[PDB]
Each structure stands twice: as C-alpha cells, then as structure tokens.
Amino acid sequence: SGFRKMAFPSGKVEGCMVQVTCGTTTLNGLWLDDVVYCPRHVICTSEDMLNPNYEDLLIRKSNHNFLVQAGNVQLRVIGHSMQNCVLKLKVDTANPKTPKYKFVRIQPGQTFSVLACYNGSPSGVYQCAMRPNFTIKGSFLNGSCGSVGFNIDYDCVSFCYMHHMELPTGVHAGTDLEGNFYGPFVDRQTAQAAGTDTTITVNVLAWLYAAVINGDRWFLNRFTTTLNDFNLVAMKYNYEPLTQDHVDILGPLSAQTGIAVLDMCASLKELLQNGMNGRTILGSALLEDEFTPFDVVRQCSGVT
C-alpha cells in the first residue's frame, strides 16, 4: 500500500535521446529508427524568435549545418524536413535501441512521464498532467527543449509530448511528436495567455478512490448528489465539468471500493464547500488532480 506520484521506467526512452546542435543552439532530439525529431526553433537566432519565417530559415540550412551526437558518436544528417513545429532529421544509422513505439496526442487531464534531458543526457524523470489549459507544470531549465513525455503501454512507448518553451508564470508548453502545439501557443517570442487553469475533477475523484483503497475514509459521507448539482458546485470552484464518460471511466474504482461515483461526488462537494478543516488525505492538505483513474488502477493493482 501507499500512494506516490509514480513515473514510467525511462530506460526505453533514455536510449533514444541525442544532442542536436545548429549554429550555437544545442538541445535534445528523439532518435527513433532513421529520424531525429527536435523543436524547429533549433534553427533560430535570438532575433529570429521575435517573428520567425521557419520555411525561409529552414531553406537557408543544409544537412551538414546539424550536429546530431548519440552519446560520443556523431550521426551523419542525410536529410531534413519540417512537420508543423518539429524538425525531422534523417540520419545514416537506425537506432538499435529504438523500442516499439507510437505517437499519440493526449487529452486535457491525461498524465505522462517526462524524461528531462540536457545535451542529450537524461537527468531526471517525473510524472505530470496535461492541464485543462494545455500547459504542463514541469521542471525545465535552459537546454531542456526536446525533452519528451511518454507513457509505456505494455512494452509499447506512446510518445505524447516534446518540450518547446516556458511561459512567464513558470508553466510549460510544447507539441505532440507530429509538431502540433498543445493549446493556443506558437513557437515565437510574443505574449500568449494560457487559458484559465481548472482542477481536473475526474482525477480528484480517482485520487479520493486511491485514498479509500489506502484506508483514508474520513471524508466519506451519507449524502449523494446528481451529476448536474455536482457540476453546479464544481464550476463555482473552477473544477472541470464531470461528464458521463468520466463517470464511466471511474466505474472500475467504484466497483472495487463499492462506492458509487455520485456518492464519491457528494464527498468532494462537501470538501469543496467546507474545506478539509486542517485534515489531510494521503498526507495532502490540497486535493490532488494529477492521477487519472487508470493511474490509480495501475498503481493499486500493480501492472508492470
């Protein structure tokens, strides 16, 4: 028992990380098969960032302008293309350590593991959620661009995130592995507001189930509610509306604990209206929303 913010084992990803240098800009790429993927702003000067025309900037580059370095050994770049906001650099060697993998776009409130990297060297792994406003609250320094987010779905690495930039609030934005930003962001140095951040209600309910499973029961009450009346209270505390699809995906946790989703919803209503009165749940003073129903099931049944 116990409950931790747990990331996926990062070995399958650590063997795909490389250093990509173009001019004096060095960041990280993802070397799958015979393609190195990286943020396209690797081609930009600090002046270019103000208002880049990436097509004009990329046309001025040749294959030899890119240093791709897998550990010590230099890869030969034999071709470069642009897909949305990512560069795909063709190289002369397929990565032996290439695992089985898919590219996947995740939805607001899904979680993933970030392998934070500097100079193609993996430095750290942590778990986070795609916020409803499509930012992530990561930990990224200068040089972290091209670090990736992933899930491991039964020995298949699902890549969902490549790091591009940090907003002035200290939150993070980037793309899927086909180069489309999560959220309304563009890879240019202008003011770009993230939406209002909301609490991921389905995730909070998942974590309250995790608490019950671990014997933290004090917040259970005799009350019940409708989905409508819950969503009325939710919306007032800047919680995401809860949908029937959410209720469905909570079904398995409901079944295992024998607490109906709408009964648990009644516990959360009272917590929101009344606070925790100096109590904690799984040692937290705040309601946690970075665990999906599937994370709680995985960690509390123990899939490998």
| Distance between CA atoms of residues 129 and 70, nearest Å | 29
| Site for a second copy, residues 155 to 194, rule: CB under 8 A | 166, 170-172
CA-wise closest residue to 91 among 106, 109, 74: 74
Q: Which of 89, 128, 234, 259 binds a second copy (CB under 8 A)?
A: 128
- 199 and 238 in contact (C-beta within 8 Å)? yes
Select the span of 23-31, 151-159, 220-228, 295-303 touching ligand SV6 (CB under 6 A). 23-31
Query: Whose Cβ is closer to ligand SV6: residue 167's or residue 220's?
Result: 167
258 binding a second copy? (CB under 8 A): no
Q: Which residue has the tokens 């240019």?
A: 188
Which of a second copy, ligand SV6, none has residue 244 at its interface (CB below 5 to 8 Å by kind)?
none
Select the span of 10-18, 180-188, 237-245, 246-254 touching ligand SV6 (CB under 6 A). 180-188
Phi, psi of 259 (to 5 degrees): -110, 110
Please give, one letter per residue, the 3-state secondary structure of 270-304.
HHHHHCCCCCCECCECCCCCCCCHHHHHHHHHCCC
Interface mask toward a second copy for 210-249; x: CB under 8 A: ----xx----------------------------------
Query: Whose Cβ is closer to a second copy: residue 119's or residue 158's?
Result: 119
| Distance between CA atoms of residues 117 and 146, nearest Å | 8
Query: Whose Cβ is closer to a second copy: residue 158's or residue 224's?
Result: 158
- 300 and 213 in contact (C-beta within 8 Å)? yes
163 labelled catalytic:
no
- 40 and 86 in contact (C-beta within 8 Å)? yes
145 labelled catalytic:
yes
User: How many residues comprise the chain?
Assistant: 304
Q: Which of 16, 17, 22, 27 binds ligand SV6 (CB under 6 A)?
A: 27
**246, two tokens:** 């959410």
| Run of H or E including 257 | helix 251-257
Interacting residue ranges for ligand SV6, rule: CB under 6 A = 25-27, 39, 41, 49, 140, 142-145, 164-168, 173, 185, 187-192
Interacting residue ranges for a second copy, rule: CB under 8 A = 1-11, 14-15, 115-119, 121-126, 128, 137-144, 166, 170-172, 214-215, 280, 283-286, 299-304
Q: Which residues are catalytic?
A: 41, 145
